[PDB]
Write a protein that binds this ligand. Sequence first.
Ligand SMILES: O=C(O)[C@H]1O[C@H](O[C@@H]2[C@H](O)[C@@H](O)[C@@H](O[C@@H]3[C@H](O)[C@@H](O)[C@@H](O)O[C@@H]3C(=O)O)O[C@@H]2C(=O)O)[C@H](O)[C@@H](O)[C@H]1O
Ligand SMILES: [Ca+2]
Ligand SMILES: [Ca+2]
Ligand SMILES: [Ca+2]
Ligand SMILES: [Ca+2]
Length: 198
Amino acid sequence: HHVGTNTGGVLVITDTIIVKSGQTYDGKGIKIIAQGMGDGSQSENQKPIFKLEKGANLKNVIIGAPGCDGIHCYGDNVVENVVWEDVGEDALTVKSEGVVEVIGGSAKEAADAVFNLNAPCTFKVKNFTATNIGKLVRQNGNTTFKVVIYLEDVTLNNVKSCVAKSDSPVSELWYHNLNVNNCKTLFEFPSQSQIHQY
Ligand SMILES: O=C(O)[C@H]1O[C@H](O[C@@H]2[C@H](O)[C@@H](O)[C@@H](O[C@@H]3[C@H](O)[C@@H](O)[C@@H](O)O[C@@H]3C(=O)O)O[C@@H]2C(=O)O)[C@H](O)[C@@H](O)[C@H]1O
Ligand SMILES: [Ca+2]
Ligand SMILES: [Ca+2]
Ligand SMILES: [Ca+2]
Ligand SMILES: [Ca+2]
């Protein structure tokens, strides 16, 4: 474990960090605290900490409270070793179509959803821990476009609502090495046959 070279620093920001297409923002272990961008409550008018344009990547940051509106992903994004110390309204939202992968890192203290999927996408969560959350993944309510979710080597503890919820019959969830402790229900999809192991 080579600790990142910005470890121990705290970057205080006052606007959304925009990562452009083809860029990788590498925080090298920096912790970010946002000011004037929200309080991390359930209010829907907060700003995202990061906006990842299509084809942009993000790695090696710790997002401190307040989590605001977390990370907005416009598709074809890799989000690697990001730690949400205290999720805000939500941790990450898929805002436009593409593949989005969350690999490594962890999330704690999500009052509602950790990941909100608001456009058709392929959404993978890999080597990830979350504790004290309402839901790990929510396809935006009452939408019927298709998402495909993969949960691979995911460990969850204290899930108040469910692991994942969608109102879309054509969406699917696939999981592989999923460990869940203390959860109300695992999956709230129209039918349980939308959920698969692999
Ligand atoms: O991208 C967003 O932040 C998203 O937030 C709202 O929607 C989510 C979710 O997609 C909705 O189904 C709805 O969730 C239900 C309740 O309102 C919520 O408080 C909780 O009890 O879970 C419910 C459920 O999962 O069905 O509201 C969610 C929310 O409050 O964050 C916005 O409505 C949506 O437009 C978008 O901004
Ligand atoms: Ca909410
Ligand atoms: Ca919301
Ligand atoms: Ca949100
Ligand atoms: Ca929180």
